[PDB]
Amino acid sequence: QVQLQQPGAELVKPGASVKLSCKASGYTFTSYWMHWVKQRPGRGLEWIGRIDPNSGGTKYNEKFKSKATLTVDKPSSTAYMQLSSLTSEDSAVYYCARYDYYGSSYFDYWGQGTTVTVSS
C-alpha cells in the first residue's frame, strides 16, 4: 500500500546540479515527514535533512546546508531534493524515507534509492 517511488539513477557531470524526486503513494502525504539519506560504499549512512510536507519546513544536517534544497509538490505528493555543484564525493545512493512524527517515531518506509554517478 505505502510506496515511495524514486527513479533509478542519474549520470551527471562534475559541477552540474540534479533534482531527485520521491513520489509517495498509499497514504496522506502531509501527515508524515520525509527525510533524505546518503549512502556511500563503506561510509555508512549520512542524514541530509528532512521536510515537513504540510508546512514546507526544513531542517538540514549543517554539512549539507549549502549543497541541498528540499521542496515538496503537495498536489502530486512528490518530495524533491536538489543537489548543486556536484563533485565525485556526491556520487552515492540517495534514499527518501517517511518518518512517523505524530505516531511511533520510526523511519518505516524507504524508497529504493537513486544512484547518482558524477563522472566526466
Binding site: 555508512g44 542524514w47 544536517n61 512517523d100 511511533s104 517515531s105 520510526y106 523511519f107 518505516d108 524507504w110
Partner: protein, 109 residues
C-alpha cells in the same frame, strides 16, 4: 556526535543476539528516539524499531529494542537466515539525526 555500533557479529540459526548503539556524548536516553533500520541485499531498507522500542507494523515479534546500560540495543530472539543483513541505528540529537556505521550480521547456515 559519533554513533558507534559493533562492526560485525556472527550467529547461528535459533540463537539470541544483541546489537548495540552507543553515543559519543554520553548515555543514550529516550530523548534520542533510537531507530533500528535493516538493509537487505539489493539496497532494500526497512524500518524495524523507532522511538527506542516501538516495533513497526509487519516486523516479526523476535525483534525487540530497549536501552541496556548506557546504550540503545536491538535483540533478535531465535535468529533466522532471513535476518542476515546490515543493521543501522540512528540517534536524534535535538535538531539532527546521526546514523551509526551499521553492523553486518552473519547467520551461519
Amino acid at each position: 556526535a559519533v554513533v558507534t555500533q559493533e562492526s560485525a557479529l556472527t550467529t547461528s540459526p535459533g540463537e539470541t543476539v544483541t546489537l548495540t548503539c552507543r553515543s559519543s556524548t554520553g548515555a543514550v536516553t529516550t530523548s534520542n528516539y533510537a531507530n533500528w533500520v535493516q538493509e537487505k541485499p539489493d539496497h532494500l531498507f526497512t524500518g524495524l524499531i523507532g522511538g527506542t522500542n516501538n516495533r513497526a507494523p509487519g516486523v516479526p515479534a523476535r525483534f525487540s529494542g530497549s536501552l541496556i546500560g548506557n546504550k540503545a540495543a536491538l535483540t533478535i530472539t531465535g535468529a533466522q537466515t532471513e535476518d542476515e543483513a546490515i543493521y543501522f541505528c540512528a540517534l536524534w540529537y535535538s535538531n539532527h539525526w546521526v546514523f551509526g556505521g551499521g553492523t553486518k550480521l552473519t547467520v551461519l547456515e
